[PDB]
Amino acid sequence: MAHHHHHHMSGTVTVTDSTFKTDVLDSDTPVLVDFWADWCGPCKMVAPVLEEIANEKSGTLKVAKLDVDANPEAARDFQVVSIPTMILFKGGTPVKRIVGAKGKAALLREIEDAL
């Protein structure tokens, strides 16, 4: 029976729903979740633009993603009409929400401006 693992070390990782309340909820940090495709089309465009905000933000936060194609129920559950959707959580709660495939600048404004 192996308990310890070497997966947590991995930076960007998708957090399951059952583990969400164990990771997000538990942790008291701003969880950046993105509800888009399986990561290929849009992710390729929102790859750098997203990394920028993270690089400037800090190196502690966590970036979670989910493939809508596989988890379509989760989309509608959180009102998701567009593919490039994102929700800025904080302590297991949707404090902010941003949607749209734009540059780091704009994407960054959608947050602060929304705050």
Side-chain angles (χ1 to χ4, degrees), residues 2 7 20-21 36 44 66 70 73-74 86 88 93 109 111:
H7 204 233
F20 207 91
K21 54 259 211 67
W36 43 36
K44 127 174 116 191
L66 163 130
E73 61 188 38
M86 171 176 115
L88 161 57
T93 305
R109 316 220 58 82
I111 323 183

Side-chain angles (χ1 to χ4, degrees), residues 32-104:
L32 266 71
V33 55
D34 325 313
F35 280 77
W36 43 36
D38 309 76
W39 325 331
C40 235
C43 184
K44 127 174 116 191
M45 308 204 161
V46 198
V49 312
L50 197 151
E51 271 166 354
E52 282 293 84
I53 305 124
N55 131 89
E56 60 180 271
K57 272 273 275 183
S58 221
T60 62
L61 74 315
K62 204 180 271 89
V63 188
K65 37 263 275 211
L66 163 130
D67 326 322
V68 173
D69 255 65
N71 320 263
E73 61 188 38
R76 43 164 277 195
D77 197 51
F78 279 91
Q79 310 303 276
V80 177
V81 181
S82 315
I83 272 151
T85 304
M86 171 176 115
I87 317 180
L88 161 57
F89 275 72
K90 219 147 100 268
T93 305
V95 296
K96 284 264 88 62
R97 178 193 246 82
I98 301 87
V99 37
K102 41 252 199 252
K104 55 99 93 118

